[PDB]
């Protein structure tokens, strides 16, 4: 029962300290929890995607141990190797578990800028850097064999390095901490945010994946495209 993050609902599978929810035949959401100190549990979500005989991960859990539990769940439930992981910015809820991925021999990718900020944010950098074009699309040579993951840098928003990921062959796109749900009362932690550019960045994410109907985000259950539009409206007020 987290203080922040979606509550458990029908069909959620508890596995150790984590929760897994199937979103599509080949896509699952992973959820892990961190107690912030007298405030209670904060849930954070990422994705697991099956692509033929391999698995792709978006975001770590908060900690190495939680991330190792995600790999255990994949081993038990899917029993295919993880080819790579993409982390969406250099903060604990998205990159806290890097060491567990590396110990497992999984290739890790992040925005070059995330890797550059990682030491200052108390994170371990990914082993490979993604770079982006002037319109935000990933340079394909930096994202080799990404299968259905379509990586897009929408512009500075929640952080300057935040990236997003569409799942090709599905109607799902992942906004990470940039996007908050359609009924959110705030944009969350704006401590590292670009308030000037936030609204345009949120709308750019919506425009990059214009037919994604299921929007997955770090701290709420998957939502409609109203998550994008509501996030942008909140950001318009900054
Ligand atoms: C939901 C939150 C208000 S708390 C969650 C996280 N917080 C962080 O990742 C922080 N950068 C952090 C977490 C633990 C310790 C220090 C900073 N991120 C925020 C957000 O996405 O807006
Ligand atoms: Cl944050």
Coordinates of C-alpha atoms in Angstrom, one line a residue, residues 20 22 27 34 55 69 73 81-82 85 92 105 109 112 139 144 151 164 181 190 192 194 199 211 217 235 237:
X20 CA 4.2 -7.3 -11.9
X22 CA 0.8 -7.8 -17.7
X27 CA 4.7 -6.4 -22.2
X34 CA 11.2 2.6 -1.6
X55 CA 13.7 -9.7 -23.3
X69 CA 14.4 -9.7 -8.2
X73 CA 11.0 -12.9 -12.2
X81 CA 17.7 -13.8 -21.7
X82 CA 17.7 -10.1 -21.2
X85 CA 18.1 -2.4 -20.6
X92 CA 17.4 6.5 -8.2
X105 CA 26.0 -9.2 -17.9
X109 CA 22.0 2.2 -22.4
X112 CA 24.7 10.4 -23.1
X139 CA 20.5 8.2 -33.6
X144 CA 21.7 -1.2 -32.1
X151 CA 13.6 5.9 -28.0
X164 CA 10.9 8.2 -23.3
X181 CA -1.5 10.8 -14.6
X190 CA 10.5 19.9 -9.9
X192 CA 15.9 19.2 -11.3
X194 CA 13.2 22.8 -16.7
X199 CA 5.0 21.8 -21.5
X211 CA -1.2 6.5 -31.8
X217 CA 4.6 6.3 -16.3
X235 CA 3.3 22.5 -17.1
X237 CA 1.2 27.1 -15.5

